[PDB]
Ligand binder design. Structure first.
Ligand SMILES: O=C1NC(=O)/C(=C/c2ccc3c(c2)OC(F)(F)O3)S1
Length: 812
């Protein structure tokens, strides 16, 4: 169409990148992938009931946790249907709740303020909103609303020769000894390895040398990088030996490399988009090779095996371990927790060994019959595995996750796509399907993919191709929403940057001029999709106090049925890599969920945090909170240290009645406990102060994501009810929690270890493929007993009490 490229313009703008360019590719994997993604899309758009879709019910299946049952150990729940109030049972479908208020079905129980319909054949107690209400001890509130017109959700239609490589040379516009080290990799595991003679290092360098590897053209497994690096390690680049059609790479190539400043960036098929000042490498791949496509173990070794298949995912495998693990393939193949180690003990450098492997996978029943382990399913999707079949079973076990869990793991999964050898993968296609199936999962997919496309040259093209596929299947409604969301931010970030260049005088001046006619009618809060936003309470927008000059904006709720005058806060900031916070906040919701399995609870406060571009993004404003210092600053501050009894007064003072003060201290121990266990494990316990806040309601929470395990300042202890070497009745509950929460995590050592490791490889700069990760093994005290550890954390608890303020004063 001569108007079709206008839609594409719509996409391009939503995406933030152009999946139509081609000045930075050397094949058609991206295109072929766009072409290939159409089937997965249709297969989903089509297989999706327009009814429940357009309404996106949000339910769970996990058993209702104790703490929330206790708050209703009387089997009774009232649902105020807009003001005739009803009382339902923890087992009544939205219909039963419709039976009452009514005694034609063109009505649906929507929620006041948000976009959260309590529709669908689901048990009342199985609605996230309902449980949220139970959590916040609030009261449910619906509204006789007419079910949404899905029409708006219509998707606009449409040889045995040894491998050799020729290294011509490297060119750079503007820059000693330097060599090129080609490496035939697979699973981030080097195989062969050939180099070059250390010639001079200048703007141009010709070697014209063929590099004859040992691996035979056959031995080459699909998904084996041709890693080219330059040493004097300054620049690197990769090439997929076998391309997306199983064919083998053959030809002349001129690759533009990435410069170094371990991590997931070093894995990419993408070349540098900046051919203006980036290093170049010339290589030649000329050829005419063409593509392709019992008994009983003893009794002492089996023990050796079970021992191995029982250690953490970190524990390295000795050459001995491996040879053993593979010789007993069919036994190791019985224990699922053995897959990772087992498939990491395969020699992909041998068509024959690999051959067996594949024929070994067809014999997997115990696996596809065993209980789904996310921590184990995740280990199979990391950097250590580059084989389609290996990774596919893992993706097959994920296909079982209900939405609630596909959201609890979305970010980490979307980040895992950086470990996929090719753009079209079961994982991407999996993300794609669940995106289109549920609008909630789709909304976050959108922003998770966008954050990367906006700052990852390394992974933007591939991500830009997975989003496009999504933006063309979600419906016309959403596409409008995303357009409105993207506008607001692109604008608001401009304001943010300006006000940083230097205030409150030109602040509202610029703000006010913004609402004028730019700021849309009502936009969706990117971190909480079920909340619209209108004009800004300009008279409330400011600029926080700090070297960083974040923007404290507050909007009004564009909703009438909303039973409150409450505002929608939003903190925009430039200067921090909010992509490390998102990941850390994600891990937090995971522990905030693990604990639930054991009905435990720590009242964590993971606020919304959505990256948006380079060193910038949005943050959620947590109502009625204050930074730990601002409290100990009104009284002291400046050059003065702190006050022991300041914080405790801040609670009783900042809380009416006595029925509110103790609560404010009750929910203060759990929260204190929660962030101590959490940060301790996450290895980020040594935090200053302005980086730690608490609510007038008692909930404390960290922010901005000679030593100590964590911050439990005497104040916290004070509030608990202890001056020092003692033990208040609450300090006990504190411990009665911590250990019960800390040991509840050890129950997932493997999971926390696989996420931690993945977080570092795709969230931080360069990553210590060794240490930095082993830190979590230590913290969780892997291997020891349900006691040595319990004491371990306690000794930690001590050091924090033993040091009073040793660092709080230092932090300079
Ligand atoms: O400059 C900053 N960099 C960050 O990462 C910040 C985090 C933060 C998150 C939630 C909050 C908050 C602050 O104060 C609040 F009460 F608004 O609730 S502030």
């Amino acid at each position: 169409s001569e108007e079709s490229q206008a839609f594409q313009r719509q996409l391009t703008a939503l995406i933030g990148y152009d999946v139509t360019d081609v000045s930075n590719v050397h094949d058609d994997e991206l295109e072929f992938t766009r072409r290939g993604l159409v089937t997965p899309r249709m297969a989903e758009v089509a297989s999706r009931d327009p009814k429940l879709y357009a309404m996106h019910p949000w339910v769970t299946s996990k058993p209702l946790p104790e703490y929330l049952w206790k708050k209703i150990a009387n089997n009774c729940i009232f649902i105020v249907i807009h003001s005739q109030t009803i009382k339902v049972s923890p087992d009544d479908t939205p219909g039963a709740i419709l039976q009452s208020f009514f005694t034609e079905q063109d009505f649906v129980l929507r929620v006041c303020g948000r976009d959260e319909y309590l529709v669908g054949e689901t048990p009342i107690k199985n609605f996230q909103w309902v449980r949220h209400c139970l959590k916040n001890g609030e009261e449910i509130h619906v509204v006789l609303d007419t079910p949404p017109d899905p029409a708006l959700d219509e998707v606009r239609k449409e040889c045995d020769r040894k491998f050799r490589v020729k290294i011509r040379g490297i060119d750079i516009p503007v820059l000693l000894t330097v060599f090129v080290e080609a490496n035939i990799q697979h699973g981030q595991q080097v195989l062969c390895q050939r180099r070059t003679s250390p010639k001079p290092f200048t703007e141009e360098v010709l070697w014209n040398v063929w590099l004859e590897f040992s691996i035979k053209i056959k031995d080459l497994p699909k998904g084996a990088l041709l890693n080219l690096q330059i040493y004097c390690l300054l620049y690197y680049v990769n090439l997929l030996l076998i391309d997306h059609r199983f064919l083998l790479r053959r030809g002349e190539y001129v690759l533009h490399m990435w410069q170094i400043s371990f991590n997931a960036d070093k894995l990419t098929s993408a070349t540098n988009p900046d051919k203006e000042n980036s290093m170049s490498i010339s290589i030649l791949l000329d050829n005419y090779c063409h593509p392709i496509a019992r008994a009983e173990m003893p009794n002492q070794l089996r023990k050796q095996l079970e021992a191995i298949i029982a250690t953490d995912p970190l524990n390295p495998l000795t050459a001995e371990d491996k040879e053993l693990l593979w010789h007993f393939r069919y036994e190791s193949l019985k224990h699922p927790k053995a897959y990772p180690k087992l498939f990491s003990s395969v020699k992909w450098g041998q068509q024959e060994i690999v051959a067996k492997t594949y024929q070994l996978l067809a014999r997997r029943e115990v696996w596809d019959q065993s209980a789904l382990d996310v921590g184990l399913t995740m280990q199979l999707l990391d950097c250590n595995f580059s084989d389609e079949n290996v990774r596919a079973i893992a993706v097959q076990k994920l296909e079982s996750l209900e939405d609630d869990d596909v959201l609890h793991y979305l970010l980490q999964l979307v980040q895992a796509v950086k470990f996929e050898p090719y753009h079209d993968s079961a994982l991407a296609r999996f993300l794609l399907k669940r995106g289109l199936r549920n609008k909630r999962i789709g909304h976050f997919l959108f922003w998770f993919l966008r954050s990367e496309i906006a700052q990852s040259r390394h992974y933007q093209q591939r991500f830009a191709v997975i989003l496009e596929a999504y933006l063309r299947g979600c419906g016309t409604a959403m596409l409008h929403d995303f357009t409105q969301q993207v506008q607001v931010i692109e604008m608001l970030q401009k304001v943010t940057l300006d006000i940083k260049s230097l205030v409150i005088s030109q602040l509202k001046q610029k703000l006010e001029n913004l609402q004028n006619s730019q700021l849309p009618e009502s936009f969706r809060v990117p971190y909480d999709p079920g909340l619209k936003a209108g004009a800004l309470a300009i008279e409330k927008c400011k600029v926080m106090a700090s070297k960083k000059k974040p923007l404290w904006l507050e909007f009004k709720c564009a909703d009438p049925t909303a039973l409150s005058n409450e505002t929608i806060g939003i903190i925009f900031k430039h200067g921090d890599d909010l992509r490390q916070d998102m990941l850390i906040l994600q891990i937090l919701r995971i522990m905030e969920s693990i604990w639930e399995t054991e009905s435990l609870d720590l009242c964590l406060l993971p606020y919304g945090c959505i990256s948006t571009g380079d060193k910038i993004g949005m943050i959620e404003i947590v109502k009625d909170a204050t930074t730990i210092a601002k409290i100990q600053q009104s009284t002291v501050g400046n050059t003065g240290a702190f006050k022991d009894e300041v914080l405790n007064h801040w609670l009783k003072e900042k809380s009416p009645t006595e029925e509110k003060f103790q609560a404010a201290v009750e929910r203060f121990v759990y929260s204190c406990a929660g962030y101590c266990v959490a940060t301790f494990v996450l290895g980020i316990g040594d935090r200053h102060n302005d980086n730690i806040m608490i609510t007038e309601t008692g909930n404390l929470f960290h922010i901005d994501f000679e030593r100590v395990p964590f911050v439990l300042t005497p104040d916290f202890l004070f509030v608990m009810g202890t001056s020092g070497k003692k033990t208040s009745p609450h300090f006990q509950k504190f411990q009665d929690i911590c250990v019960k929460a800390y040991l509840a995590l050890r129950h997932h050592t493997n999971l926390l270890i696989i996420l931690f490791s993945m977080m570092l490889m795709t969230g931080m700069p360069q990553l210590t493929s060794k240490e930095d990760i082993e830190y979590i093994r230590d913290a969780l005290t892997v291997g020891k007993n349900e006691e040595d550890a319990k004491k371990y954390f306690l000794d930690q608890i001590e050091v924090c009490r033993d040091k009073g303020w040793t660092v709080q004063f230092n932090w300079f």
